[PDB]
Amino acid sequence: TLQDIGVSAGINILSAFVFFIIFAVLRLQPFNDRVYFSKWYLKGLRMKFLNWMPEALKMPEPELIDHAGLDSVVYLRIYWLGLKIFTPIAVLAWAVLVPVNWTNNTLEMAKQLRNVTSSDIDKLSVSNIPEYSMRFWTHIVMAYAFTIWTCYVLMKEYETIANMRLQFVASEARRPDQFTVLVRNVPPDADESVSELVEHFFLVNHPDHYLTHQVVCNANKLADLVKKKKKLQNWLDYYQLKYARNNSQRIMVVDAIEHYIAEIDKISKEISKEREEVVNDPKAIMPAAFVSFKTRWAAAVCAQTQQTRNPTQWLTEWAPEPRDVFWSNLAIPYVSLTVRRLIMHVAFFFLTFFFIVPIAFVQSLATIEGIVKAAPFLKFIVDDKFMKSVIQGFLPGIALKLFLAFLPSILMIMSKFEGFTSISSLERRAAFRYYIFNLVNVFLASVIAGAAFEQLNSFLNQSANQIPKTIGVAIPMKATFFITYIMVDGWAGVAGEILMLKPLIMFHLKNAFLVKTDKDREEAMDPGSIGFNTGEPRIQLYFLLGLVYAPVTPMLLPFILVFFALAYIVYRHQIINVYNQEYESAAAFWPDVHGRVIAALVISQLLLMGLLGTKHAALAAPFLIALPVLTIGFHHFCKGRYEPAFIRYPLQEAMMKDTLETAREPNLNLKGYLQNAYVHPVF
Amino acid sequence: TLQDIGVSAGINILSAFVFFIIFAVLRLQPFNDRVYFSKWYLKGLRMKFLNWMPEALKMPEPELIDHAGLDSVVYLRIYWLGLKIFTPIAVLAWAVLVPVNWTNNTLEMAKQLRNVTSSDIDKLSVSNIPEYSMRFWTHIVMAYAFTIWTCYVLMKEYETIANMRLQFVASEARRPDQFTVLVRNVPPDADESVSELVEHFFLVNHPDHYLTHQVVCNANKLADLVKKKKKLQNWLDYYQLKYARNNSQRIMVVDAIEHYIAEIDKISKEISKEREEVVNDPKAIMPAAFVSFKTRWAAAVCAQTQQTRNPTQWLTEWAPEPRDVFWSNLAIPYVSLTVRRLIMHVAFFFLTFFFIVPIAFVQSLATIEGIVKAAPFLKFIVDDKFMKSVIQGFLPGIALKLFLAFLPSILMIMSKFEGFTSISSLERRAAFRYYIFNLVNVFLASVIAGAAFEQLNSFLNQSANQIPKTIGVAIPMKATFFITYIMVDGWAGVAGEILMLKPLIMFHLKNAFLVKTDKDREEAMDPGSIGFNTGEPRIQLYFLLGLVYAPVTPMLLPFILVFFALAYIVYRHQIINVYNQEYESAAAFWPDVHGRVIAALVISQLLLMGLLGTKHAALAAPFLIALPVLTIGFHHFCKGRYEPAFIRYPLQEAMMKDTLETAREPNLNLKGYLQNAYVHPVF
């Protein structure tokens, strides 16, 4: 379907450059300066179409770290890791595997019983290599030449990030983070509050340091009413400022009264339940607190060591950041966390079940050649030499992207059902859930449940006879669908995101209908963070499509390369200019990303075993079992030598930065800075 | 072979009671009071044949803990855990599975092609149940009724040991252990010694507490010469005290001179290389030290947390005990440890290879019925109705025990090749190595490489036809060999060890030939510890033989029960009276024992799957895959809720015991107690 892939990529490229032209025109308007330069406003300072790509590369990395942050820079380093990995894989896959496969005409042996393709398998892989053949001694050493070298890149980068983290976090500005420990669970007592329990624990066990504890209020209903009150005042602005350019009888459902008396009701509830939260309710005081110390060393001790007999009471997390704590999940009791997880492993098992139907509905539309040759009817979807290319190359990608346009938000809500009192861990487990959802339905339940449609004459006319051989041929045949998915979802989806329409339309609507001046900068935060819910494991999906199909057909490799090369420039321009970073992690997600790339390697070799086990290659599988040993052993090496720069904060640097801070500024209290830092953002 | 099993067990029992009579006679001699009551001498105090079993049960467990120790009591609790587990397994295996199997005469259908047994499979298991049958719905729920209940016992005991440990170690007497941390690796420097590196590290990072460091001398050659000097003075005592009851021309090889001038040579070397060890040799000062603190809290902090950037420098162990530190392995450089491990995984792979031949040489002797019916010759080993029982029931156990009479010492040496600077971890990894050696050669390479001999007519006359079915029948047929191995190795081996001949003969020889008085108490320590190299994973071998054959033939279960019931009384008498305990761990080996029993459970269900997959039991395997999920999930539960009472010493108890000790005795230094505690036992 190269006649189809060319048309699909042509539509995608000649729409993506339309997006670039629209961005180049619409950026230079003077009114949208608050949109496309919003982070510059957040830092407190007010023909030649693509003349922004060289501007986004002039700024060096340490100035970017001191300007943007440390999460987004290493997020760019994910894309540079992708460009580093897949360049020589594609180089050694062009000049080696393509002269191997183009020679032997085994799918020109097509009138073996029913296998009809055209002029693409001659560029494809092991399907074109016949049974028990001699060509496979190429691929396996190329397999080594892929998985030894990518482990070298994954070692070198994961060295240059732990060093990068330890250089950053031992020199960043003082937060009220590095002195504070969450004390998540605590046993009840006949004492009148949790506060004296935390006092008589930490005065006895940490008698020297112990700055000031702070318990966690419930405040769920109160914050929900504050959110509803602000939303109601937003509509009270909208309906009332329609009247300032109109006449009497304003609204319909006297009627402007029908929000302001509701405002009086809500304020009468606000003052009541804000009075009735910290006066008469010890019941609304959850068993948790934010303790605090006067050295970073003491908090580093307190939040790494076992505290008591039970490893369920007094357990200490690292107290994320006061602008990072996802409140209204500190109000979940601890003993009901493991229930809420086991619920959302079941419903996730449903989300890998209900979404199989919109997967297969794609591929039946994507391989109508696999239906026309398998079922005689042509007054329906018919070969017309051009609309076949549209129905097989463009609409499957658009359809599969539009079925995925909601599920990052769904998995974000589903992670919010569990506790995870930080945005910085909600986004990590949301990325993990969307990675599993891409690995099951977008990859496996696409390939297995679609290649049966793609070779339906094989399963139809001659059943249960060569059913390993047909499904072994059909998996490298299903690279064209991922080519189109790259060219639609990744390619134009990163080439169309620059024109940030979903915040810009809302910004114009809030310009046109609000009150007055002195408010035109709260909506510059409406472009949120980088997509770590959305765009983070999409990268790992393309890593999976690269590494799985690297000893398999190299027609996914150059498209992955140009996607990475474009998205690096796109996201680097975005991180320089339009991004917020509502949390400093800092880059504490590489034990997840590195692990998922290693799991992509392991799945790559375990699927290469399945592809070599369908051509009766006898002495080919024994020289491939060494790789799931070698990669998992390399992962256990990296889990020991580099990962405890991410988990365990060492005490030498915790004392070093403390003494350096007491050399920079002496003689300031921390109680004026940090005693009232973790009070709920109601108060 | 019940006619053979009865004769084997009769010989073993009627020799074991001969051992008990010899012990009862030889104990009441007045001269061996230093042997069979040696621990009572170590604690500083000077018809009715089996009248010692009720005496060994009168003493309650807390007095035993305050008398013997805390390792040996929980070592007895291993045997009581065995008696707790396998009693209702045998009860519910008699009254359920034996009326199932005795009914259906499918091995009385014996003239299916070549299968000849006699009157034992009617008591055995799934071999006697025919293909795709209805009896198996018993066994699987009995499988649940074994693996749910044993996990309850493994939860309850592992609760009553972590509580037992935390009650003991938070109330024991003061050692110079709980204040001391080994600092195993340290980077070099242009500074003149490692001592100033340890000083300028710990004064800066732990400025409050920091009692006194102590570096580790090399002292290998010096300690080897001290050992040779003491051995040479032992022979200098022996040859000279032969002269005190003889005449001139004493020895042969003037000749008594031929040891005393060698003594002068050795002392001239001792004073030289003891002078030339701490004066002119910074090269002989290894990069390690024993740091020390003045609170237990500070040492608990120092030996749980990451120290620096690298997790290879300044890494901190727990500094075992000064009478526990296996010296001359602190003199191994750290960077050469991982080489020495990877050597001794290879040679261990050789020890699982060379010892296959003495395994199979046993079973060919053990199943001559499987050779006579498979190879016509009878002027060799012949059926004579009694010597068949001797050659099949007694000599395989004796032969297999005598091939194993050296390998605990071999694995002890092999663990000494690695570093492991404690006896308390050398014995743990020696127990792990001997567990793997029992699981591979004594269990798997016995069963697979012997059942082929046991059904050699099946593999001979009709080959490659029912080779899953024959090897599925033959594995429950190979329970009689483990019956005899229990009755020889375990049974009489624990019933014959009471008469502790290997220290007693040496004690009589050292009484007859040494110098004078004032020396008759150093040889009471010659009975060493409990067998944790030798006798610890023998228990787990019988756990494996119980749990694997519990849904399989219950003719191993009562013999395991009476072995446990006898060995509990035997080892409890021994631990009360004759044992030393050269190290207090205290019971820090249950994450190993609990893990190996859980692995025995997992191997039990994964071999039960293999036994059900040989009778074409279709709807029997799907209701058995849940158990390797359930047991490993239970192991991940116990690794989280109970294990960090063994690994991570909590800080609340470390401050509690410190304040209680300062309430018991105030105002004593630790430098008079602990500054010179870890100097090498040369000095």
Numbering used by the authors:
A (entry chain B), B (entry chain A): 3 to 48, 70 to 276, 288 to 717
What text comes from the article?
Via genetic screens and functional analysis, the osmosensitive Ca2+ permeable cation channel proteins were identified in Arabidopsis by two independent groups, which was named CSC1 (alias OSCA1.2 according to the OSCA family nomenclature that is used here) and OSCA1, respectively. OSCA1.2 and OSCA1 share ~85% sequence identity, and they both can be activated by hyperosmolality treatment. In addition to Ca2+, they are also permeable to monovalent cations such as Na+ and K+, suggesting low cation selectivity. Members of the OSCA family belong to the calcium-permeable stress-gated cation channel family (entry number of 1.A.17.5 in Transporter Classification Database), a subfamily of the calcium-dependent chloride channel (Ca-ClC) family.
Here, we present the structure of OSCA1.2 from Arabidopsis thaliana (AtOSCA1.2) determined by single-particle cryo-electron microscopy (cryo-EM) with a nominal resolution of 3.68 Å for the overall structure. AtOSCA1.2 forms a homodimer, similar to nhTMEM16 and mTMEM16A. Each monomer contains 11 transmembrane helices, in contrast to nhTMEM16 and mTMEM16A, which have only 10 TMS. In contrast to nhTMEM16 and mTMEM16A, of which the dimer formation is mediated by direct interaction between the transmembrane helices TM3 and TM10, the dimer interface of AtOSCA1.2 is exclusively formed by its cytosolic domain. Despite the separate biological functions and low sequence similarity between the AtOSCA1.2 and TMEM16 proteins (~11% sequence identity between AtOSCA1.2 and mTMEM16A), structural alignments reveal that the last 10 TMS of AtOSCA1.2 share a similar fold with nhTMEM16 and mTMEM16A. The ion conduction pore of AtOSCA1.2 is in a closed state in the solved structure, as revealed by pore radius analysis. The conduction pore is constricted by a set of hydrophobic residues, which include I393 on TM4, L434 and L438 on TM5, V476 on TM6, F515, F516 and Y519 on TM7 and L575 and L579 on TM8. We have also identified two long helices in the cytosolic domain of AtOSCA1.2 that lie parallel to the membrane plane (named ICα2 and ICα3). In AtOSCA1.2, the hydrophobic linker between the two long cytosolic helices is identified as an unique structural component and may serve as a sensor of osmotic stress. In the structure, this linker protrudes into the lipid bilayer as an anchor, and its partial deletion impairs the opening of the channel under hyperosmotic stress.
